[PDB]
Symmetry: C3
Subunit: 226 residues, 3 copies
């Protein structure tokens, strides 16, 4: 099985650990043994002019996934929204009401459907490939999320007198001479990881430590030696 998935993750945090905006949207291609990805795309947001409320994220995700899908022709696309695995081309007012989610989630996806359902329909007509709202259950979505963490640190390294990056849930990053490695901290997930090439700038220090206000999320902090 070959799967393309996408996710947005990583946030700039202020000094009191409040998120300012998100950083990276990533689409990944995942193949057996489903532990990493060797082919991926990234789109960076502007975290300082980001609306957390919101929903530019899912639109960017489905677009980027389709873009990667046109190149690598996967069996299926996984979208990071836990709706029970329903096909996005089948999302109308009727099927959304039947979904087992909150009344808030329903009214929101009714709004999203107006743009996303035609998009998925067209792509399915072209290829037969479904875009499914699978979310939390998907390992490829989790690998995308890890890559969003990695690319968030890459963005931070490239844009830093100091920066705080809130990583996606329970993952760590490690800096090497010419690359950034990201790993899940949850061994129950079976060793999920990512690796991205980058030049590491000089004159800066970094630290990885727990977000004190959001348990199981780590902060990657960059400081200038200046």
């Amino acid at each position: 099985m070959r799967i393309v998935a996408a996710d947005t993750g990583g946030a700039v945090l202020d000094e009191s650990f409040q998120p300012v905006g998100l950083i990276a949207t990533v689409a990944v291609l995942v193949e057996k043994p489903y532990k990493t990805s060797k082919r991926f795309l990234v789109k960076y947001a502007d975290p300082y002019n980001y609306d957390l409320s919101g929903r530019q994220a899912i639109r960017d995700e489905i677009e980027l996934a389709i873009e990667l899908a046109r190149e690598v022709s996967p069996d299926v696309i996984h979208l990071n929204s836990t709706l029970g695995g329903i096909e996005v081309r089948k999302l109308d007012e009727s099927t959304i009401d039947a979904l087992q989610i909150s009344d808030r989630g329903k009214e929101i996806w009714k709004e999203l459907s107006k743009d996303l359902q035609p998009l998925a329909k067209k792509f399915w007509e072209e290829t037969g490939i479904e875009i499914i709202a699978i979310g939390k259950s998907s390992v490829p979505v989790r690998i995308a999320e890890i890559y969003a963490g990695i690319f968030s640190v890459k963005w931070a390294l490239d844009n830093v007198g100091g920066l705080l990056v809130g990583l996606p849930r329970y993952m760590e990053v490690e800096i090497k001479k010419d690359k950034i490695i990201g790993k899940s901290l949850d061994p129950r997930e079976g060793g999920l990881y990512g690796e991205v090439k980058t030049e590491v700038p000089q004159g800066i220090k970094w630290e990885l430590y727990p977000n004190p206000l959001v348990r199981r999320f780590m902060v990657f902090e960059i400081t200038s030696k200046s």
Copy 2:
């Protein structure tokens, strides 16, 4: 405390990782320090003629648990159903409605009650030993579940041009020359593990990796060198 528990787990998967049927029912005796089992029984189902909505699993579990219990005389039997630790001999329509569970769970256990409650009642009359629906809270149940994973791999090795075994949640297996070792991947459980003696066949290769559609579940895949 000496505990007999049982669980059914391990599934044959098709190539799209969809479960076909379950494989192993195991009953274990668990004693201090409650990390493994040295005395256990196994019953193999036919996964290609299995009704996944048949719920033959729990009936198989309580029978196998009672069978082992008669041999080792434990203090209590743990059944894998998270009902708050209620005694099975006390399960009637009255007590089931009072349970803090789903309405589907309630209707499932009203039917199950018809056979299981008399079974538990007789066993208690005979021995004084309760059968409790403790489920997720039980460490002996989790050890039973880990052994079901191991015996499923043993079954796979003994019955394979290729097989996909879907393991119980977040556990790994290790193949040695004359045995299979199973371990929880969750260190929060405090190091739960099992070990089963077996002959490992020639002319086959294997791999353990994440199920891409079900996060925190692993797949054990066997392939012929063919």
Copy 3:
């Protein structure tokens, strides 16, 4: 950021692993990198005269947290009750009704408000420091909980002819010549730990193993 948090944890168990009463209330000061605490207070309960439904735990916690806060002057106090981070001084029946919690949770905090809300307002007036009900979301709270586990084992060491201590969720303890080290068993938490100096008595054996009735909780057993 400098944070004071508190928690009650650790229980005496009987031979069938049923909890009898809680042992330790701990308040900690937590600073960057937010993995441990070097400054903390402990208050021991009487586990053999404890009402597990009494909710003395939360009253003891806010008292001890405030006590430590007066000394180390933190930015904020974290209380171990998952109410969304609401300020305790802002807790009246009106704001409690709006809380996204169970009807039982609401009626418990209806009761608690009578004493704790004036206390928080009083403390805020004196220092400007908020007491927030953040609970599960807080790392300092988890560090307090780990310390409650450590102090429960110290209590076990100080009172042992034999004892079963049920530790807080998924943590381990290790006994060294002159100290007890406690660690989260969950690597997702990113390496939370604590360490307490104590004199370890002679003539004792101890063992740590899973509570067979409560998955992901460990038992500390000590014998003479």
